[PDB]
Design a protein around this nucleic acid. Structure first.
Ligand code: MG
Ligand code: MG
Ligand code: MG
Ligand code: MG
Ligand code: MG
Ligand code: MG
Ligand code: MG
Ligand code: MG
Ligand code: MG
Ligand code: MG
Ligand code: MG
Ligand code: MG
Ligand code: MG
Ligand code: MG
Ligand code: MG
Ligand code: MG
Ligand code: MG
Ligand code: MG
Ligand code: MG
Ligand code: MG
Ligand code: MG
Ligand code: MG
Ligand code: MG
Ligand code: MG
Ligand code: MG
Ligand code: MG
Ligand code: MG
Ligand code: MG
Ligand code: MG
Ligand code: MG
Ligand code: MG
Ligand code: MG
Ligand code: MG
Ligand code: MG
Ligand code: MG
Ligand code: MG
Ligand code: MG
Ligand code: MG
Ligand code: MG
Ligand code: MG
Ligand code: MG
Ligand code: MG
Ligand code: MG
Ligand code: MG
Ligand code: MG
Ligand code: MG
Ligand code: MG
Ligand code: MG
Ligand code: MG
Ligand code: MG
Ligand code: MG
Ligand code: MG
Ligand code: MG
Ligand code: MG
Ligand code: MG
Ligand code: MG
Ligand code: MG
Ligand code: MG
Ligand code: MG
Ligand code: MG
Ligand code: MG
Ligand code: MG
Ligand code: MG
Ligand code: MG
Ligand code: MG
Ligand code: MG
Ligand code: MG
Ligand code: MG
Ligand code: MG
Lengths: 130, 252
RNA sequence: GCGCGACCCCAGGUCAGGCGGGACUACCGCUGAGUUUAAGCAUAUAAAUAAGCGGAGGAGAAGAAACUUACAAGGAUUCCCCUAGUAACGGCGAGCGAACCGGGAGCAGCCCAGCUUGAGAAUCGGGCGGCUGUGCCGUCCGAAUUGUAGUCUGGAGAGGCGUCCUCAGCGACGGACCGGGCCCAAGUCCCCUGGAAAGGGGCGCCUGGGAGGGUGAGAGCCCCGUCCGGCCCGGACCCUGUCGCCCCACGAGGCGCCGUCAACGAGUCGGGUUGUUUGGGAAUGCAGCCCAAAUCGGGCGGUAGACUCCGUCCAAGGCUAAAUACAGGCGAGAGACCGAUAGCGAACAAGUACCGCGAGGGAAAGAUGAAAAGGACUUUGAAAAGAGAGUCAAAGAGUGCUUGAAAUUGCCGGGAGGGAAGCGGAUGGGGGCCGGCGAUGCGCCCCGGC
RNA sequence: UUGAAACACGGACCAAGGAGUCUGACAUGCGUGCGAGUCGACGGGUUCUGAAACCUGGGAUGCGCAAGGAAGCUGACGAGCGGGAGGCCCUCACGGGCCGCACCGCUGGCCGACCCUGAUCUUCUGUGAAGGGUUCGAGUUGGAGCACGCCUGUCGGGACCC
RNA sequence: UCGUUCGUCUGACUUGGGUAUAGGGGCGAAAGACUAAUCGAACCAUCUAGUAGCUGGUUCCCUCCGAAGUUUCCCUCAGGA
RNA sequence: UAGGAGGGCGCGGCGGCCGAUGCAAAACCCGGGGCGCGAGCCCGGGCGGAGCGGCCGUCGGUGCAGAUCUUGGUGGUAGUAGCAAAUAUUCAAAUGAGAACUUUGAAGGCCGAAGAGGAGAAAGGUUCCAUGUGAACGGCACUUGCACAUGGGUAAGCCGAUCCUAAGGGAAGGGGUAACCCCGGCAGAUAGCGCGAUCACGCGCAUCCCCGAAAGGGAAUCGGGUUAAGAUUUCCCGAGCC
RNA sequence: CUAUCCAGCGAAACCACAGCCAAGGGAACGGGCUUGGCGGAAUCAGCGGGGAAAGAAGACCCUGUUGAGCUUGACUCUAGU
RNA sequence: CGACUCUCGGCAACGGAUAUCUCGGCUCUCGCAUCGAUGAAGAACGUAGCGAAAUGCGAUACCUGGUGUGAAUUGCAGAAUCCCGUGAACCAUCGAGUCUUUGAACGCAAGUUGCGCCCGAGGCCAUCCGGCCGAGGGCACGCCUGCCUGGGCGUCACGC
């Protein structure tokens, strides 16, 4: 149960916050989980998903399909992954939509900012357990 | 409770006026003007669409009702007694079937516990964990309108833990457990001791708290309670056993 | 053939400045009804209200007794409770209606004018220059003697004397309060169903975290969050907490005595009369006009009057937090509230479309799907479309598309009818439907085994 | 409406909405608590889901505990009778006797307004032994009340709706 | 409004545009005429959900009890005590 | 009957208890079976696709057939009343899916110029012109259009406005006013000073500011050409004028 | 020229349920009730007897302790003079 | 047998009730104190590769700048150097900027983009070492402090 009398526990406000969040806020909301191998290696559970990351679907009808992130299409709360597609009636091919909370990031697109971000998150999870 | 009421001005933001008689329509006030579907439509009536309600609710309803200070204390006394009767604690729905004794008093070593995991062992060593099981298992979404009025989940009641010493930590070991409530000994609440208005809340007393009860409520003697102007209520019937009275030698 | 100085007025696109308008919740001033009630109606009531005209702030207004009381008296203002539906007022009708005492919240008191620089305007503004720069310094003009400063404000005070007792500032680090950014527990393990597992069963784990939300169906462990707190950045602050240097005075203040002085607000008070207002009643406040003061004097003591005594305060100038109010603004948090004819008029390009010359009036209108995967292609047709097909768990969920009632309508099957039909009781014929619609078991017995 | 099948009015049909409520004062009844008391209702303290709960004050706040007078004022000196539920004593028991609650009836005492009365005492205008009354009181000779809750009723409010 | 028929047509004539008068006010060769289809007092918003002893309506079942149109007073006679 | 009371039924929340549901919740549908005197209730079948129910206490914007009730939807009337003023059309051909209604030609008629012709002021605002067009709309129809869609189009020293004053309006100082506002001749160092001068001074100051007319007053233009749509005089050619 | 018939287009008023009469009774003039007369599908064009036909909460009259315009020797006031 | 009318059932229409929702409303509580001549509120017109409305903005016009974050925006198209970095973004936030015409609205007006005056950087010639077109910018009213210019026998002094 909440203690901070500045955070709202109302269904109406919490939904408004979610569905009217700006782009800089959807990056955190559309966050994915590290794989078992990476969670073991970086000591972080989950990260905000990036353009060139590699994922594996773990819940959809496409469960067990791996691929590369090709678009983090924040305006629809979705990511398209390479070759995760279906064909339209006319025969054209379209990329199907995946929510970041139903994939695991099997490989990281690491940068200077990502390395620092992994550090800060790793410094944290240890700072409570120890 | 918080008050609720309609807007004071609602249904009364039109310049509508009755056409009168002679036009083959009822005499309800109507919206004048023209150029829109609103023109000529009824207004201000509780039968009209867009009108104000009959007897609009006001915030100066009587939300809060007063009870005598003494009647509050009498009812708390009755609720406490019923917590000590196994048949009534059973009948009110608590699984009390492996508990050793009623009243259920546990040592003061419980006081210093810290974790929800620590609290779970204590309930297991009593016969208390089964009742806490039922509370957690019974959690579901509230049927009806309340699930969208910020009251989405409901559950059953578990046991109530009463501690005596102020400033303890079992407040924080038990709070994550659905159904389980913690109370301090001096300031007990009737809403916990008889929730739903039904007698028989399952109470786990700490030894620190069970010994303060005689301090708090006193006896059948004047000025013995910590409370002022209070004496425990006496019954209308000293022994309620109709078996013993009806089948005594004196009456037969 | 003057030039003076001051007085009162000019005009300046002179140097520098400040004014007006906007918003309505709450606040200050003015002005000001009637509906209504009195079972009629005129005083009364509605109401010192609505409308009208203005003025402010974050609060505003009030405020430090020309007060109450009649007591062993109390002691600024405001607000709550009580006083109290009371005293009073009232075609004494309908009705109306405070205050003192008492109990709480919060408490805080100040500053002018006047006799009192005269060896000396010691005061203040502006230009210019400089610097440590919300100010200080120099200098030159000017204001002001028809009075700037200092003293002093009735509780006093000026004087006089007197052992005595009291006084200067800037550093340094912070604590609090204020805003912001980040970081932080545990399963997505095995089987089944399903389009989808967030469902069921198995086995586990977190919990100072089972508030809430998202994610393809009731998710603590999938994601954001929540608990405990950690960190980094930036403020305003003028409140206090400690270390450093500087040491407060012959000026002022306190305190002890003295009795010589002892100044205290004028067309104002106060009285008459008129109108309004009030619970205020031989007149509660206010305002017009007339009369018009006093200094052993003035204002009060809720019945007008004269005298004796008694209690009480000192108007006619000014400032002053806190406790209080808050349908507006901005920023939050909640709810036994409403659920698209409800809730604001407006959940939506709603004060919109549209109407009116105008002042103004003022709607209707939410929901495909988990995902557009929104129906390629063939065939008939001028086309719209149809028939096949394709997508989908599903399209019979097909772009006003979740469900999809009634009124009313078409088709198919059945039934009946000589100027209504429907209806209540009877039953007969047809239908249509009902297997808990309706039983086959129990007692003696003889084996042949359990 | 005395009287409706009416040549009385309203009603073409269907869906949805649609009218004795909230509040303040009082009253009777009922329930709860305490009881000559009873209310903690403005505050304060405390309270980690709670605007909740819990504690505190009151030696005088409200109502009650005393009334009659316009007022100045004065302020209940202690009740008998008839009938009575019920209990007890007697009788073989029918019948008798004793005590008798509530309630009904009857007659009184006392307080007060008004009238009447007057020993003694006293601060000379007060007191009041005795003795009163076809008078009047929402009096006393029964302490029963206070708080909360609900229905009903009267009234004020938009006040059942138009 | 239309058809036919009518009145007047150098005049106190017809007419456009500009301008003046605004609600117990205007303007009137006077009809209470006209003042934006509104006139014996326009229109708009508000006071205002104005008041009505008067008309209309007033939403589920069963069971039990069950009336009055008469008295007195009232500017009382369709009302109330 | 009016009226009063009791006991129930039903709707939506809240505190409690007990439960159903993707092996199909709610809602709705039925010539399905039953229970209850009744309010109502239980089950079956179907449709639907994610929520719901019973019991105790408690609470309320809690039960409709009416109100010339409110809003929405729907009938019968009824393929009915009706589409009838302004004299009138006809033949061939083209086009086109389709022609009484479009286009060309021919014929027959009408307005008869105080016009059914050619141009403007007000008012409108793109209706103008070209190209194309599924629906709607053009009260039959349409290939069509004043509709819909996409584009294009308004050229000035000389036409106007602009300048001047009319009736009249606004207005500074001043007068009134609680203030919003109301008063312009009331006469004030009235606003503005004007003119000659500059290389500075002089003179004079009288009835005085602004607004108000695309019909009053008024600097100046004519002819000939040109576009799908602009011009008679805005563009081009020539010739002038202020 | 309509009406009429055809192609195309296509309303509204009104509507408890309806729609053949005679007498009786009845809220004293019935489509429905009582008793009789009768009574046979489905359609077209007209007509104005009836539906006490539609239109409009009678404007006449009365009532109301509802108004308003106007008047005056009504009551109470008031600008002006 | 049929037509018509009425009726029962099944299916199909018509219509939008019901159920289930909800970035909306309503109510209560809390914190704070911030418009304008330095031109506000309000009005108008513009502004995007493809936009009418709403939202945003102002000729620097769905934005410029700084800072934080750290790789998108998205209906289509395009530059993409913008990817271990001065670095994407219909991102957040705010200090630097811009801010058309109006409006208390201010040079006079207004059914007018109408009608004046003043200054003036910049350029041209010489009718001067002045004059011509200027980019930009002023000119409202009342008031206060100072100043400059001036008026009147109002009161004086001193003269002539
Ligand atoms: Mg009608
Ligand atoms: Mg409403
Ligand atoms: Mg007044
Ligand atoms: Mg009123
Ligand atoms: Mg009256
Ligand atoms: Mg009345
Ligand atoms: Mg009257
Ligand atoms: Mg007002
Ligand atoms: Mg103040
Ligand atoms: Mg009282
Ligand atoms: Mg009053
Ligand atoms: Mg987590
Ligand atoms: Mg699972
Ligand atoms: Mg959830
Ligand atoms: Mg977390
Ligand atoms: Mg007076
Ligand atoms: Mg003051
Ligand atoms: Mg609405
Ligand atoms: Mg609406
Ligand atoms: Mg389906
Ligand atoms: Mg569907
Ligand atoms: Mg769904
Ligand atoms: Mg549907
Ligand atoms: Mg149907
Ligand atoms: Mg048939
Ligand atoms: Mg039958
Ligand atoms: Mg049968
Ligand atoms: Mg009658
Ligand atoms: Mg009749
Ligand atoms: Mg009637
Ligand atoms: Mg009718
Ligand atoms: Mg209904
Ligand atoms: Mg008391
Ligand atoms: Mg007795
Ligand atoms: Mg008696
Ligand atoms: Mg009422
Ligand atoms: Mg005629
Ligand atoms: Mg003629
Ligand atoms: Mg003629
Ligand atoms: Mg004319
Ligand atoms: Mg004219
Ligand atoms: Mg006449
Ligand atoms: Mg009403
Ligand atoms: Mg009647
Ligand atoms: Mg409700
Ligand atoms: Mg209702
Ligand atoms: Mg209905
Ligand atoms: Mg009814
Ligand atoms: Mg016809
Ligand atoms: Mg005709
Ligand atoms: Mg002519
Ligand atoms: Mg054209
Ligand atoms: Mg047509
Ligand atoms: Mg002009
Ligand atoms: Mg002209
Ligand atoms: Mg002209
Ligand atoms: Mg030319
Ligand atoms: Mg036809
Ligand atoms: Mg007959
Ligand atoms: Mg009839
Ligand atoms: Mg018959
Ligand atoms: Mg026939
Ligand atoms: Mg016929
Ligand atoms: Mg007829
Ligand atoms: Mg009729
Ligand atoms: Mg009538
Ligand atoms: Mg009467
Ligand atoms: Mg009258
Ligand atoms: Mg008279």
């Amino acid at each position: 149960m909440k203690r901070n009398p500045r955070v709202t526990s109302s269904r109406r406000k919490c939904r408004k916050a979610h569905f009217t969040a700006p782009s800089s806020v959807r990056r955190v909301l559309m966050s994915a989980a590290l794989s078992s191998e990476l969670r073991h290696k970086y000591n972080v559970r989950s990260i905000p998903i990036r353009k060139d990351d590699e994922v594996q679907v773990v819940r959809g009808t496409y469960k067990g399909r791996e691929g590369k992130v090709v678009q983090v299409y924040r305006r629809r709360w979705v990511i398209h992954v390479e070759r995760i597609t279906r064909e339209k009636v006319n025969g054209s091919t379209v990329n199907v939509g995946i929510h970041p909370s139903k994939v695991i990031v099997t490989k990281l697109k690491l940068d200077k900012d990502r390395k620092a971000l992994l550090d800060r998150k790793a410094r944290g999870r240890a700072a409570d357990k120890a | 409770r918080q008050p609720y009421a309609v807007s004071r001005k609602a249904g009364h933001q039109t310049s509508a006026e009755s056409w009168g008689t002679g036009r083959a329509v009822s005499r309800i006030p109507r919206v004048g003007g023209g150029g829109t579907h609103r023109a000529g439509q009824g207004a201000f009536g509780n039968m009209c669409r867009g009108g104000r309600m009959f007897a609009p609710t006001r915030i100066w309803r009587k939300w809060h009702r007063r009870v005598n200070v003494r009647l509050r204390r009498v009812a708390v006394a009755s609720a406490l007694a019923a917590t000590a009767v196994p048949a009534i604690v059973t009948a009110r729905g608590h699984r009390i079937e492996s508990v050793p004794e009623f009243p259920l008093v546990v040592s003061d070593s419980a006081e210093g516990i810290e974790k929800t995991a620590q609290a779970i062992k204590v309930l297991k060593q009593l016969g208390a964990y089964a009742d806490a099981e039922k509370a957690k298992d019974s959690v579901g979404i509230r049927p009806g309108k309340g699930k969208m009025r910020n009251r989405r989940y409901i559950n059953r009641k578990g046991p109530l833990i009463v501690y005596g010493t102020e400033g303890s930590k079992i407040v924080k070991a038990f709070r994550n457990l659905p159904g389980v409530d913690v109370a301090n000994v001096e300031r007990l609440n009737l809403l916990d001791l008889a929730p739903g208005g039904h007698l028989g809340r399952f109470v786990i007393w700490t030894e620190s708290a069970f010994k303060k009860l005689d301090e708090v409520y006193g006896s059948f003697e004047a000025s013995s309670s910590k409370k002022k102007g209070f004496v425990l209520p006496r019954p209308k019937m000293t022994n309620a056993d109709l078996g013993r009275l009806i089948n005594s030698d004196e009456v037969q």
